[PDB]
Structures are given as structure tokens and as C-alpha cells.
Amino acid sequence: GSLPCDICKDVVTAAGDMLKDNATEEEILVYLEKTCDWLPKPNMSASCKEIVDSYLPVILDIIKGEMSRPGEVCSALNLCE
């Protein structure tokens, strides 16, 4: 899969699991930012940050809306084919 697709799957899964543990949205952002910062290449970190900043908000809304399948959520947002 494309890099945006691969990152999206991570983000949606992470956000979903953390919400199911009643994590706060702020904490979720902090967690995902860490992931972005740990990625081994600058282009990966950059793509991760852009995806988190652009899509995490609506992803949280979608999961709260009872839709948490990573592949499906990401395909809908056109991050996956």
C-alpha cells in the first residue's frame, strides 16, 4: 500500500483502540505525534504529521460515530485505494 494508506491504518487503529480505553482526544494526538516523530525518515515523519493534522479530527468523529474499521475508514477518506 501507499505510504498515506499505511499511515492511515495505523492512525485509525490507534485512535480507535485509545478511545475504547476512554483516552482523551488530546492524549490520542500526543500518542500519534510520537509515532510520527519516531519514523526513521524525514519524509515519513512529515507525511505522518500532515495526515494526523489533516485527518485525525474527522477520524475521531467517524470512530465516535461507531465506524472504526481501519481499511474502510481510510479508503473512504481516499488515503487507501
Numbering used by the authors: 0 to 80
Paper text:
Saposins A, B, C and D comprise a family of small, non-enzymatic lipid-transfer proteins that are essential for the activation of GSL catabolism; genetic defects in saposin function cause specific forms of lysosomal storage diseases. Each saposin shows functional specificity for the activation of certain catabolic reactions: saposin A (SapA) activates the hydrolysis of β-d-galactocerebroside to ceramide and galactose by the enzyme β-galactocerebrosidase. Whilst they share less than 35% sequence identity, they all adopt a common fold consisting of four amphipathic α-helices organized into two ‘fingers’. SapA is known to bind lipids and detergents in a pH-dependent manner; this is accompanied by a striking transition from a ‘closed’ to an ‘open’ conformation.
However, previous structures were determined at non-lysosomal pH. This work describes a 1.8 Å resolution X-ray crystal structure determined at the physiologically relevant lysosomal pH 4.8. In the absence of lipid or detergent at pH 4.8, SapA is observeed to adopt a conformation closely resembling the previously determined ‘closed’ conformation, showing that pH alone is not sufficient for the transition to the ‘open’ conformation. The asymmetric unit contains two molecules of SapA, both in the closed conformation, with the characteristic saposin fold. Analysis with PDBePISA suggests that the two molecules in the asymmetric unit form a crystallographic pseudodimer and not a stable quaternary complex. This is consistent with observations that SapA remains monomeric at low pH in the absence of detergent. The two chains observed in the asymmetric unit are almost identical, with a backbone r.m.s.d. of 0.46 Å after least-squares alignment. The largest difference was seen at Trp37, which was observed in a dual-occupancy conformation in chain B only, indicating that this side chain is mobile. Comparison of atomic B factors shows that the α3–α4 hinge region is more ordered in both chains of the pH 4.8 structure than in the pH 6.0 structure. There are no large-scale conformational rearrangements accompanying pH change, emphasizing the absolute necessity of lipids or detergents for transition to the open conformation. However, in combination with the structure of closed SapA at pH 6.0, this work reveals regions of conformational flexibility, and the crystal packing suggests a tendency to bury the negatively charged α3 helix at lysosomal pH.
